[PDB]
Design a protein around this ligand. Structure first.
Ligand SMILES: CCCCCCCC(=O)OC[C@H](COP(=O)(O)O[C@@H]1[C@H](O)[C@H](O)[C@@H](OP(=O)(O)O)[C@H](OP(=O)(O)O)[C@H]1O)OC(=O)CCCCCCC
Ligand SMILES: CCCCCCCCCCCCO[C@@H]1O[C@H](CO)[C@@H](O[C@H]2O[C@H](CO)[C@@H](O)[C@H](O)[C@H]2O)[C@H](O)[C@H]1O
Ligand SMILES: [K+]
Ligand code: NA
Ligand code: NA
Lengths: 339, 60, 44, 187, 187
């Protein structure tokens, strides 16, 4: 008996949430946008090719200054590039090659990385005596570090294959808050621009919204039929896009608490590795396993163009804060800048 | 099972009791934001070389 | 694609940040004969 | 007088080819010497260059593993007058053991080939080098003959030195050929 | 013109390191060549120097036992452009077979490392030497990468040539690792 009440209670609770969403569902984003002029021909060209990494790149991150960026590769290096000159500002050697994520701090003072080592190493880029040495090793997780993003020089969030995310205090090396909830490995997270909340895509085929201050899960978004490897906030912070093994990108609204759109096309069977919005949020840029980055009209739901320059998988994307350029990282060990 | 069911039930209760907005508003809002900042997005508009930093031609 | 060695035999490697450059002067004979002809004939 | 200069009259074939030889799958490249004079104490060695990662985590940039080309029989010591086809038998111990025709182009590797011997006149040792990147390794091909007989002398035709032609050749890795043989002998 | 002078532009790493590589415990030192020109017929050999006493009574002052660094595969014959990490696999036949992290510093030994090849321009053979005494052998360490890619050329960063970093590494002797493996495979 006792187990039935609870199982049945769980099911009815979904319906309310189910119907409540359907109550809000009075129109489709496509129908509303049917008025707008389509985006036109989006054909960009490679303005830079960053050459240096000796093996697959797993993630890269633009700096808030829209010029410098970090990259991480199994060659064992964090390379901090000057996208303008191509000049390598820092080449940081790692203790392990199994790196999965890197993150550039907003202030340009720090940079973080971690992976199958289960540690988030924070690297000081302006050490007392002009060197690049680890300043903290954030230990606590019981699974690979899948992603991480700085809030400020003293705080950073992380996601892990141990089905949790965490809030850390760099100053003390302690884990401030544990965001449990997911029933699968957490592959990606995304920080809201006001950093008051964040979303996280996982291998339970769901994204979750988390209150940074409260340390609680607010909403859970479903729809994807497979793992989520990339998740990304819409520039206004009230909506976000996800990329999945199920060959689709999907837009979700926070306030409406549901999916608005699905971005898919036949001839696209492979997974999505990265997603990113342009400065105004009109373009959705998705990195795919077939070596391409596809550019979508985020409102209209169709392909605006495609970036073909890489010989192996596009594993990471990034649009500058000043909206001027897009970065692509690839398993062919190159990064490229598109305009 | 039991301890995880109660975990779920209690989570769903909290997701149920939240304020929601109609899609039409939510949708037109995104659309609005886009049409508002359309001017600040160089990736819709093939970038004029003067304005582009990554093209080192400039005025030439 | 980048290769390590060219078909003609030359090697695509540069030796950067040689802090102790005096060593090139220590075995001067090797540096001399390793030079381009213009530079031997010049020095000569 | 420096010997590296001799390398100019030592040629390597433009491609390496893979084809079957007396039941063994072999990687072959051809070498030649344009002069009537000799390369004394001639010898051929070959290194496979490709990056790798240890179980423990260590990335090794351009890892050199010696390719066998006669070491245990002294058939790596060449008597090189007319062109020679150097053969690497792709056996259990080969780095091409698990590489099929299918996989080859998707491998990121490079074979460095080194010919070292003494210029006959100056006792000095020369080192001629060349490389075969993954795209220059023709699967299912054979080198075109160059040798013909003339009155009192064997004549070489260097026009044909680099030329190859296609033959019937398995798409399977050397390893998979063994698996067919294991069931064939057990049948 | 004497070749020993070349040794000046041949560097040995400042330390030897011991760490795990694909399940094997290895003693590693790194070697480099500062010039664009080559060391022809390059080869690396290594000798362990420590005194000993026979069962019968004979003391042998500074007994040299060759350390294996590629002899049976010809991987001791180097193609040395960018820096190489020479690896001695510490196996049953190794003189470090019964040496644990604990015992190392209390051993009274010295590894002599010898690089011998021909200066490219003069055919003459050079011999570069160095030594690693027991205190210069870092247990549980890895060499820091030096190679990076640039447009059309691989660039070496000699600032990092001597640099090492620590990794997770057993304190046990290679022999004791085998004993764990014997029970693991038998389990
Ligand atoms: C006055 O001109 C000098 C004239 C040409 O020589 P030049 O000044 O152009 O310099 C030579 C040129 O760079 C060759 O390419 C080199 O041969 P390789 O391509 O490196 O083999 C050669 O080096 P090495 O090979 O002779 O050391 C260089 O010396 O030679 C007499
Ligand atoms: C102080 C002494 C400085 C000069 C030492 O001698 C110097 O040796 C180096 C290494 O072979 C050569 O260096 C040469 O090749 C290197 C590649 O490694 C190039 O990046 C460099 O631009 C070029 O000059 C110089 O041409 C020679 O002049
Ligand atoms: K000899
Ligand atoms: Na000849
Ligand atoms: Na060299």
């Amino acid at each position: 008996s006792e187990l039935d009440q609870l199982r049945q209670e769980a099911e009815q609770l979904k319906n309310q949430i189910r119907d409540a969403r359907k109550a809000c569902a009075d129109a489709t984003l496509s129908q509303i946008t049917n008025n707008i002029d389509p985006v036109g021909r989006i054909q960009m060209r490679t303005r830079r090719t960053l050459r240096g990494h000796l093996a697959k790149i797993y993630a890269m991150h633009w700096g808030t200054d829209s010029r410098l960026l970090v990259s991480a590769s199994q060659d064992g290096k964090l390379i901090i590039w000057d996208s303008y000159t191509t000049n390598k500002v820092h080449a940081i050697p790692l203790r392990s090659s199994w790196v999965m994520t890197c993150a550039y701090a907003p202030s340009g003072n720090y940079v973080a990385c971690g992976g199958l080592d289960n540690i988030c190493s924070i690297y000081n880029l302006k050490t007392r005596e002009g060197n690049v040495r680890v300043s903290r090793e954030l230990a606590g997780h019981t699974g690979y570090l899948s992603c991480c993003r700085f809030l400020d020089d003293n705080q950073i969030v992380t996601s892990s294959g141990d089905t949790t995310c965490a809030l850390w205090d760099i100053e003390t090396g302690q884990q401030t808050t544990t965001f449990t909830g997911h029933t699968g490995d957490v592959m990606s997270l995304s920080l809201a621009p006001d950093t008051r909340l964040f979303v996280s895509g996982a291998c339970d085929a769901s994204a979750k919204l988390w209150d940074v201050r409260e340390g609680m899960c607010r909403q859970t978004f479903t729809g994807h039929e497979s793992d989520i490897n990339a998740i990304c906030f819409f520039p206004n912070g009230n909506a976000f896009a996800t990329g999945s093994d199920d060959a689709t990108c999907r837009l979700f609204d926070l306030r409406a608490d549901q999916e608005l759109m699905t971005y898919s096309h036949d001839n696209i069977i492979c997974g999505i590795t990265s997603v990113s919005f342009s400065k105004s949020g009109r373009l959705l840029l998705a990195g795919y396993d077939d070596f391409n980055c596809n550019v979508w009209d985020a409102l209209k739901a169709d392909r605006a163009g495609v970036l073909a320059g890489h010989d192996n998988r596009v594993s990471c994307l990034g649009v500058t804060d000043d909206g001027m350029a897009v970065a692509t990282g690839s398993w062919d060990s190159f990064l490229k800048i598109w305009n | 099972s039991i301890a995880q069911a109660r975990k779920l039930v209690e989570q769903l209760k909290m997701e149920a009791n939240i304020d929601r907005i109609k899609v039409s508003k939510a949708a037109a809002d995104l659309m609005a934001y886009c049409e508002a900042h359309a001017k600040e997005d160089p990736l819709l508009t093939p970038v004029p070389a003067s304005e582009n930093p990554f093209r080192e031609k400039k005025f030439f | 694609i980048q290769r390590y060695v060219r078909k003609d035999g030359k090697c695509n490697v540069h030796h950067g940040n040689v802090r102790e450059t005096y060593r090139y002067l220590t075995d001067i004979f090797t540096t001399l004969v390793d030079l381009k002809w213009r530079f031997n004939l010049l020095i000569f | 007088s420096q010997p590296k200069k001799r390398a100019e009259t030592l040629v390597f074939s433009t491609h390496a080819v893979i084809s079957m030889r007396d039941g063994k799958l072999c990687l072959m490249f051809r070498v030649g010497d344009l002069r009537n004079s000799h390369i004394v104490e001639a010898s051929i060695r070959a290194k496979l260059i490709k990056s790798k990662q240890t179980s423990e985590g260590e990335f090794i940039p351009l890892n050199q593993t010696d390719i066998n080309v006669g070491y245990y029989t002294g058939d790596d010591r060449l008597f090189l007058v007319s062109p020679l086809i150097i053969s690497h038998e792709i056996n259990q111990q080969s780095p091409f053991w698990e590489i099929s025709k299918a996989q080859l182009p998707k491998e990121e590797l490079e074979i460095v080939v080194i010919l070292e011997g003494m210029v006959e006149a100056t006792g000095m040792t020369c080192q001629a080098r060349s490389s075969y990147i993954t795209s220059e390794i023709l699967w299912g091909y054979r080198f075109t003959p160059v040798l013909t007989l003339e009155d009192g002398f064997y004549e070489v035709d260097y026009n044909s030195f680099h030329e190859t032609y296609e033959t019937s050749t398995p798409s399977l890795s050397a390893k998979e050929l063994a698996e067919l043989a294991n069931r064939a002998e057990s049948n």
